[PDB]
Amino acid sequence: AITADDIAVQYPIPTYRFIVTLGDEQVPFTSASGLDINFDTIEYRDGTGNWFKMPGQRQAPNITLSKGVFPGKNAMYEWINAIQLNQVEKKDIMISLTNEAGTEVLVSWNVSNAFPTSLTSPSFDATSNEIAVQQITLMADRVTIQTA
Amino acid sequence: AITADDIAVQYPIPTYRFIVTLGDEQVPFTSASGLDINFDTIEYRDGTGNWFKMPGQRQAPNITLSKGVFPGKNAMYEWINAIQLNQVEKKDIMISLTNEAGTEVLVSWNVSNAFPTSLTSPSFDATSNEIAVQQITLMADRVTIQTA
Amino acid sequence: AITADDIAVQYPIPTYRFIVTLGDEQVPFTSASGLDINFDTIEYRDGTGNWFKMPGQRQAPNITLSKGVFPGKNAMYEWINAIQLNQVEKKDIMISLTNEAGTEVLVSWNVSNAFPTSLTSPSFDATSNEIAVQQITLMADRVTIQTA
Amino acid sequence: EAGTEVLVSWNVSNAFPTSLTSPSFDATSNEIAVQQITLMADRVTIQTA
Amino acid sequence: NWFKMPGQRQAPNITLSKGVFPGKNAMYEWINAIQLNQVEKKDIMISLTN
C-alpha cells in the first residue's frame, strides 16, 4: 500500500506537465530548457602550497522556449519586433511544474528580466509530417527556484 | 465533436504545405529554412553590481531554399549568373503556409531584399535513386512575419 | 562452490549501490562522476640526450552529481543561492560503495573542500516520460580514496 | 613539497622598495587583487645546500 | 663603497572609466570648469566592497 497522497509528498516529479507564465499571461509551450545557475571560478596559488578556490561572479542565463505555430496572432513575433536599439519590454518568466489538473505548483523556476534575442522559423519540408515550431531564446539576469 | 472549422482556428499548422512567392512569380520548392530573427547582446557591468543587459543590432538572415532540376529553363541559374560586381536584382521572398487547396494564407514569413550567394549542383551518383536537387542560399536584411 | 563470503573478498564491486555523504547529511543521488586524480607534466631535455620526465602539480577535480526533483525543499538550490562574492559553505563529500543493506563501506572516494559552481534545470518537454533531474557540478581541491 | 627542505636559494642582501602597484579594478574580471613591489638591492648570491 | 637611497616619490596618474548615460555627464562638468590654474580638487576613495 502506497496511498497516493504519499506519492504527492515523496515521489519525484516528471517533466511533461508545466505551465509557463510569461509576464502576466500564460502561453502554452512545448519545450523549455536552459534555466541554469552558473558561476565562474577564482583561483590563487602561492609558493608555499596554499591553493585558494573561490566562486566568481555568476553569468547570465540563456533560456530557450519552443511552441507551435497557430493560425491566429503571433505573440512571440510581436515581442521581438518591438526592439528599438535598447528598448524591449522585459518580462518575468515563471515555469512551474504543476499537477495534472493545472491548478497548483509543485516546484517553480523563476526568471527575472528576460528579453528575446532570437526567434527561429520552422523548417519547411514538403516530405514531412510535422508541426511548425518556432523556437525563441531569451536572455535574463537571475534564475530563482521557489518550492511550495 | 470537433467540427473542423474549429480545427482551422485553434489547431496548429503543419509544414508540408507552403507557397514560395519569389519576387513576382511562384516557384515550387521542396525545402525552405533559415528565416530567423537574431539579435546581438550589449552588456555593461560596474563595480557596484549593476549588470545592464540590452539587445544589440540584428544581423542579416541567411535563407536556404532547395528545389529539383527540371528539363526546361533554370530560373535560379539565370538569377545568380546576373552578378556584375555589385549588381543583382534583389527580390522579395514570401513563404506562406497555405491551405490544402493553395488559395489562402494561414501565416507567412516575408523577406525583404534577398540576393543569391550560392547555388550547389546535385550530387551525381550512378548507384542512387534520387532526384537532382539544387540548393540556393540567399542573403537579406529583414524577416517579417505576417499572420492572417 | 564459491561460498559467498568469498565473493565479498575477491570479486569486484558494481557501481549501482552508493551512499553520498554531503557535509554531515546523506542526500540520495542518481549519478556521480568526475572524482579524478590528475597531474601535470614537467619535461626537460638537454643536448646530450637526457630527457627528464616529472609529475607536475595536481589540478582541481570537477565533480558532477545529479538527483531528481522532489516536491519538498530543494537543498541544492539553498547551497548555491548562498554565494556572496567569495563566501560559500564548503562541504566534505563522501561517495562510498556500500553493501546492499546500506550499512558498511566497501571502498570510498573522499572529496575535501567542495563548493557548487553550476546547477542545471531539468529539460521540460511535453512529449517525454522522464523525471526532472537537476545536475550540480562541484569544485574541490583533493580526492582521497579510503578502502576498508 | 612538504616544505621541510631547501634545495637551492637566492640571497638578496640590502633591499628596499622603490615601487608598489595597486590592483587593476575591473568590473568584468574574475581575478584576484594582485599587488607587485619592486625592490632595489646591491648583490645577489646563490647558496646551494 | 656604493650607497643606494630612495629618492622622492613622483605623482600618481589615476585612470577611471565609466559608461555614457542619458542623464548629465558628471565627469564633464569637473573637467569643463578648468579656469587656467583652477580646479575643484577632490579626494577619491576606491574601496573593495563585499
Side-chain angles (χ1 to χ4, degrees):
Chain A
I2 204 65
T3 178
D5 286 330
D6 288 336
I7 291 172
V9 176
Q10 65 189 359
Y11 280 4
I13 304 167
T15 58
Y16 63 90
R17 186 64 61 199
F18 61 95
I19 303 297
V20 177
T21 301
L22 173 49
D24 54 353
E25 296 179 354
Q26 294 181 359
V27 176
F29 287 96
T30 301
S31 297
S33 66
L35 286 83
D36 302 336
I37 299 169
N38 292 317
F39 284 91
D40 290 330
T41 294
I42 316 295
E43 293 179 356
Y44 182 77
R45 285 176 284 181
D46 55 355
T48 60
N50 294 318
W51 205 303
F52 296 105
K53 301 180 183 67
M54 286 164 282
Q57 55 183 353
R58 57 184 290 165
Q59 64 266 19
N62 289 319
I63 296 98
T64 176
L65 301 172
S66 68
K67 69 182 292 294
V69 175
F70 285 89
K73 179 257 190 182
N74 205 164
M76 299 304 106
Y77 176 71
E78 291 290 327
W79 180 44
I80 201 167
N81 208 170
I83 305 294
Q84 302 294 319
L85 182 147
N86 285 320
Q87 297 180 359
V88 55
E89 184 178 2
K90 267 72 180 300
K91 289 180 171 65
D92 303 336
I93 316 297
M94 184 187 296
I95 304 172
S96 299
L97 292 177
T98 321
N99 58 354
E100 291 176 352
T103 60
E104 63 95 20
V105 178
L106 298 175
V107 62
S108 178
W109 283 262
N110 303 117
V111 161
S112 295
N113 285 318
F115 65 97
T117 62
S118 70
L119 181 64
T120 65
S121 68
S123 65
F124 294 141
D125 195 1
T127 63
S128 68
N129 291 317
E130 292 178 354
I131 295 297
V133 173
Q134 290 174 352
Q135 182 175 1
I136 184 166
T137 65
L138 301 173
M139 182 172 173
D141 48 355
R142 186 178 174 85
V143 174
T144 303
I145 300 172
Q146 67 177 357
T147 176
Chain B
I2 204 65
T3 178
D5 286 330
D6 288 336
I7 291 172
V9 176
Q10 66 189 359
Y11 280 4
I13 304 167
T15 58
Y16 63 90
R17 186 64 61 199
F18 61 95
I19 303 297
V20 177
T21 301
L22 173 49
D24 54 353
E25 296 179 354
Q26 294 181 359
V27 176
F29 287 96
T30 301
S31 297
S33 66
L35 286 83
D36 302 336
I37 299 169
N38 292 317
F39 284 91
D40 290 330
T41 294
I42 316 295
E43 293 179 356
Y44 182 77
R45 285 176 284 181
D46 55 355
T48 60
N50 294 318
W51 205 303
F52 296 105
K53 301 180 183 67
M54 286 164 282
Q57 55 183 353
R58 57 184 290 165
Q59 64 266 19
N62 289 319
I63 296 98
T64 176
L65 301 172
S66 68
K67 69 182 292 294
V69 175
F70 285 89
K73 179 257 190 182
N74 205 164
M76 299 304 106
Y77 176 71
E78 291 290 327
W79 180 44
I80 201 167
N81 208 170
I83 305 294
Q84 302 294 319
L85 182 147
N86 285 320
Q87 297 180 359
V88 55
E89 184 178 2
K90 267 72 180 300
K91 289 180 171 65
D92 303 336
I93 316 297
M94 184 187 296
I95 304 172
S96 299
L97 292 177
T98 321
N99 58 354
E100 291 176 352
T103 60
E104 63 95 20
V105 178
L106 298 175
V107 62
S108 178
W109 283 262
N110 303 117
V111 161
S112 295
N113 285 318
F115 65 97
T117 62
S118 70
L119 181 64
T120 65
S121 68
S123 65
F124 294 141
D125 195 1
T127 64
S128 68
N129 291 317
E130 292 178 354
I131 295 297
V133 173
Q134 290 174 352
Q135 182 175 1
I136 184 166
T137 65
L138 301 173
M139 182 172 173
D141 48 355
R142 186 178 174 85
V143 174
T144 303
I145 300 172
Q146 67 177 357
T147 176
Chain C
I2 204 65
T3 178
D5 286 330
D6 288 336
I7 291 172
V9 176
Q10 66 189 359
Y11 280 4
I13 304 167
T15 58
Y16 63 90
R17 186 64 61 199
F18 61 95
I19 303 297
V20 177
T21 301
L22 173 49
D24 54 353
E25 296 179 354
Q26 294 181 359
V27 176
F29 287 96
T30 301
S31 297
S33 66
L35 286 83
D36 302 336
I37 299 169
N38 292 317
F39 284 91
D40 290 330
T41 294
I42 316 295
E43 293 179 356
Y44 182 77
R45 285 176 284 181
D46 55 355
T48 60
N50 294 318
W51 205 303
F52 296 105
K53 301 180 183 67
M54 286 164 282
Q57 55 183 353
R58 57 184 290 165
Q59 64 266 19
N62 289 319
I63 296 98
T64 176
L65 301 172
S66 68
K67 69 182 292 294
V69 175
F70 285 89
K73 179 257 190 182
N74 205 164
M76 299 304 106
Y77 176 71
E78 291 290 327
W79 180 44
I80 201 167
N81 208 170
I83 305 294
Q84 302 294 319
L85 182 147
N86 285 320
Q87 297 180 359
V88 55
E89 184 178 2
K90 267 72 180 300
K91 289 180 171 65
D92 303 336
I93 316 297
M94 184 187 296
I95 304 172
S96 299
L97 292 177
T98 321
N99 58 354
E100 291 176 352
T103 60
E104 63 95 20
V105 178
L106 298 175
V107 62
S108 178
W109 283 262
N110 303 117
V111 161
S112 295
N113 285 318
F115 65 97
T117 62
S118 70
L119 181 64
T120 65
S121 68
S123 65
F124 294 141
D125 195 1
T127 64
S128 68
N129 291 317
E130 292 178 354
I131 295 297
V133 173
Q134 290 174 352
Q135 182 175 1
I136 184 166
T137 65
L138 301 173
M139 182 172 173
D141 48 355
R142 186 178 174 85
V143 174
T144 303
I145 300 172
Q146 67 177 357
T147 176
Chain D
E1 186 60 12
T4 64
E5 181 182 1
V6 170
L7 299 175
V8 61
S9 63
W10 284 260
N11 296 116
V12 168
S13 69
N14 284 320
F16 63 94
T18 62
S19 178
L20 180 66
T21 69
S22 66
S24 179
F25 305 101
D26 193 2
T28 61
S29 68
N30 293 317
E31 292 182 356
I32 295 297
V34 171
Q35 288 176 349
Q36 67 179 356
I37 184 166
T38 74
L39 302 164
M40 182 168 171
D42 46 354
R43 67 184 182 272
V44 176
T45 60
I46 301 168
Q47 64 179 1
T48 64
Chain E
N1 302 319
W2 179 23
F3 299 94
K4 302 173 184 66
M5 287 166 278
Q8 48 187 349
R9 56 187 287 169
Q10 59 259 16
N13 290 111
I14 315 299
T15 303
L16 296 170
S17 72
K18 66 173 290 186
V20 172
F21 284 90
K24 63 183 288 292
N25 205 160
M27 297 302 107
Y28 175 72
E29 295 103 16
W30 180 42
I31 198 168
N32 206 172
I34 306 293
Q35 295 294 321
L36 194 156
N37 279 321
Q38 287 292 320
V39 51
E40 184 176 1
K41 290 185 178 182
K42 293 178 172 65
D43 45 351
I44 310 174
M45 193 189 300
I46 302 170
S47 302
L48 289 172
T49 318
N50 71 359

